[PDB]
Amino acid sequence: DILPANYVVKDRWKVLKKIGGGFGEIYEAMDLLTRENVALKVESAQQPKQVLKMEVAVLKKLQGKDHVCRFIGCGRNEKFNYVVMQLQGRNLADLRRSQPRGTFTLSTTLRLGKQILESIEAIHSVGFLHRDIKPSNFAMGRLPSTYRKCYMLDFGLARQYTNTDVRPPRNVAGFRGTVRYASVNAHKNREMGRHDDLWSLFYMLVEFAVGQLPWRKIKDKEQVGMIKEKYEHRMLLKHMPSEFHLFLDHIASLDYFTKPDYQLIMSVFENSMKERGIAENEAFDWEK
Numbered sequence: 296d297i298l299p300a301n302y303v304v305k306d307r308w309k310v311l312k313k314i315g316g317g318f319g320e321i322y323e324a325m326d327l328l329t330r331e332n333v334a335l336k337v338e339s340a341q342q343p344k345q346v347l348k349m350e351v352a353v354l355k356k357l358q359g360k361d362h363v364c365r366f367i368g369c370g371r372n373e374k375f376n377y378v379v380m381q382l383q384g385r386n387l388a389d390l391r392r393s394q395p396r397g398t399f400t401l402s403t404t405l406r407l408g409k410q411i412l413e414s415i416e417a418i419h420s421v422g423f424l425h426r427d428i429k430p431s432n433f434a435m436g437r438l439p440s441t442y443r444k445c446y447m448l449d450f451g452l453a454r455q456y457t458n459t460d461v462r463p464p465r466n467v468a469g470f471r472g473t474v475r476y477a478s479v480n481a482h483k484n485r486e487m488g489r490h491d492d493l494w495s496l497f498y499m500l501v502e503f504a505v506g507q508l509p510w511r512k513i514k515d516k517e518q519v520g521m522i523k524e525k526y527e528h529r530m531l532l533k534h535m536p537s538e539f540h541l542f543l544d545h546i547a548s549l550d551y552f553t554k555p556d557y558q559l560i561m562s563v564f565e566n567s568m569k570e571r572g573i574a575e576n577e578a579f580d581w582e583k
């Protein structure tokens with residue numbers, strides 16, 4: 296599936312360059328019909344664990360939500376599976392690292408948190424957990440209408456948590472997401488819930504504002520789990536707005552079964568902005 300420059304998919308999508316890879320590969324391609332560039336994500340037709348089909352189903356389920364890429368097309372063929380979707384821009388991990396001290400201002404952090412919370416509530420509203428919420432899976436828009444909006448990417452680790460509602464949890468479930476942002480529950484092999492996506496958001500926002508997490512330099516997953524289990528998470532909030540204590544206590548109180556109080560978390564962000572005079576139309580840090 297290493298497609299050369301000027302390769303053309305279904306007589307419509309002309310590959311320009313590889314822009315991601317691993318699971319599968321991601322290409323920037325030109326849509327020969329609509330004449331915009333698009334993101335073209337491919338999965339080898341021989342690779343054993345085939346998840347691109349569920350990624351498409353979640354992406355279709357989310358069409359019409361904010362912070363979701365447009366679905367453009369998909370196809371299954373003898374060599375690879377693919378999905379074509381709206382192309383987005385810079386991801387939040389790269390944007391954070393390009394900041395002079397590797398931190399965002401509280402204005403950018405809080406306003407990003409509002410959008411990421413909206414994204415998470417959206418995928419949960421269609422019956423799925425993301426299970427890999429992290430800053431490289433959010434990308435800012437690249438159009439006049441979208442450049443102040445971030446977009447949720449990569450449903451490859453998603454799991455449906457409804458049956459037809461809340462699905463019976465497995466007694467012990469394997470963890471396969473990203474260690475740095477994973478909740479304690481994910482580390483302890485508990486079946487993941489909506490609250491564990493919100494834990495990842497909590498950790499992301501602390502890292503945005505403080506610039507690091509205490510276990511960042513430990514790559515042993517089991518060690519990181521024990522560190523998080525023992526860590527006094529209120530220490531994470533020493534230089535955060537005090538409303539974040541509300542967010543921490545809420546998600547700490549949740550189990551697999553209980554619907555999060557997304558509105559409570561949104562009000563943490565909204566109240567934090569009001570206390571500080573932060574306005575929704577402020578420049579983001581990367582805007583010059």
Ligand SMILES: CC(C)(O)C#Cc1ccc2[nH]c3c(c2c1)-c1nc(N)ncc1CCC3
Nearest residue numbers: 314315321334350381382383448449450451
């Ligand atoms: C189908 C779905 C929703 O599950 C997915 C996914 C997806 C997984 C991995 C990815 N890596 C990159 C991207 C990406 C997307 C990416 N995607 C888009 N649309 N624009 C720009 C980029 C930036 C280049 C890096």
Ligand code: NA
Nearest residue numbers: 325329330331
């Ligand atoms: Na043109």
Ligand code: NA
Nearest residue numbers: 384385436437
């Ligand atoms: Na861009």
Ligand code: NA
Nearest residue numbers: 436437438441
């Ligand atoms: Na965009």
